[PDB]
Design a protein around this ligand. Structure first.
Ligand SMILES: CNC(=O)[C@@H]1Cc2ccc(NS(=O)(=O)O)cc2CN1C(=O)CCc1cccc(NS(=O)(=O)O)c1
Ligand SMILES: [Cl-]
Ligand SMILES: [Cl-]
Ligand SMILES: [Cl-]
Ligand SMILES: [Cl-]
Ligand SMILES: [Mg+2]
Length: 297
């Protein structure tokens, strides 16, 4: 059971060893497509690639490659697309993927500039009156509104397929204070944000998979999705004891390499799931407590 394990790991001080076991046992599958010469400029990082089996294929229209992976959690019955922060030349591909996959939400866990460097392109419009057109992929993207909180911002975007003139509302959930290779300020801040994404309907099985990204699309993205899937598994069963967090992470790692990048992000995932379990099992009042503790105003 997770809380008993958490205490024993903490008391023995063995998070590094536990994390190392995950690193050791993780799946290794080919990434031949990602490594083709023609795709080099579509990858942000040499050593972060989608496995071939689970990569998202673009539907237009000469090169189908994007650095993105479908994490399909069979038992939990939820899917996510995890991807790198788009590059200056892949913003059109990114939105093409959102359109083709029928995603309703995009969760962004990094900032455009981190540590002095550009870790993600400015792939969405910052001003309503300055929409973006992706001419390569024939999409237009307009900012409709934004709700700026202290440590996250929610935006309503309108994405239009210019080929058909169909439009869709996309919700963008931007966590602005999660440091790279670090953790959220508290379980409460993280869970307040995850529940905002949940409350939006963006994770509904009636939509395509939510798109989740950070800079590499593995460390912060892996942490978010691990906590969400674990909470969903225990919710379906109404049984916190049934959930094996390390097994769930190894399952996720069958679909994309490197998910969760540090031992402390693994520790944080346990903290977030143990805390969130209080809400799942019917202490509704905890949600308000997280909102207060997160100091979102
Ligand atoms: C120090 N590592 C790097 O700078 C690069 C670039 C980079 C930048 C940002 C982030 N953080 S995130 O939250 O934005 O995903 C991760 C990575 C991963 N990188 C790697 O080289 C990863 C290589 C890799 C791939 C698969 C597994 C592992 N190791 S494991 O411990 O996760 O099993 C490492
Ligand atoms: Cl930013
Ligand atoms: Cl900076
Ligand atoms: Cl960039
Ligand atoms: Cl950072
Ligand atoms: Mg204005």
């Amino acid at each position: 059971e997770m809380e008993k394990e958490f205490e024993q790991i903490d008391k023995s001080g063995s998070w590094a060893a536990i994390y190392q076991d995950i690193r050791h046992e993780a799946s290794d599958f080919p990434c031949r497509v990602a490594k083709l010469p023609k795709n080099k400029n579509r990858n942000r990082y040499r050593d972060v690639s989608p496995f071939d089996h689970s990569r998202i294929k673009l539907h237009q229209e000469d090169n189908d490659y994007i650095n993105a992976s479908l994490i399909k959690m069979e038992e939990a019955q939820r899917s996510y697309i995890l991807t790198q922060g788009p590059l200056p030349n892949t913003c059109g591909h990114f939105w093409e993927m959102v359109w083709e996959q029928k995603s309703r939400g995009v969760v962004m866990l990094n900032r455009v500039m981190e540590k002095g460097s550009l870790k993600c392109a400015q792939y969405w419009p910052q001003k309503e009156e300055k929409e973006m057109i992706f001419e390569d992929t024939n999409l237009k993207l307009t900012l409709i509104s934004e709700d700026i909180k202290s440590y996250y911002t929610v935006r309503q975007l309108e994405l239009e397929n210019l080929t058909t003139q169909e439009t869709r509302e996309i919700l963008h959930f931007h966590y602005t204070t999660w440091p790279d290779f670090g953790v959220p300020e508290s379980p409460a801040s993280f869970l307040n944000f995850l529940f905002k994404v949940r409350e939006s309907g963006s994770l509904s099985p009636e939509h395509g998979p939510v798109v989740v990204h950070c800079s590499a699309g593995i460390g912060r993205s892996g942490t978010f999705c691990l906590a969400d899937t674990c909470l969903l598994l225990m919710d379906k069963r109404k049984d916190p004891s049934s959930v094996d967090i390390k097994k769930v992470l190894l399952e996720m790692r069958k679909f994309r390499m490197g998910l969760i990048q540090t031992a402390d992000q693994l520790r944080f995932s346990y903290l977030a799931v143990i805390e969130g379990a209080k809400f799942i099992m019917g202490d509704s009042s905890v949600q308000d407590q997280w909102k207060e503790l997160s100091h979102e105003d």
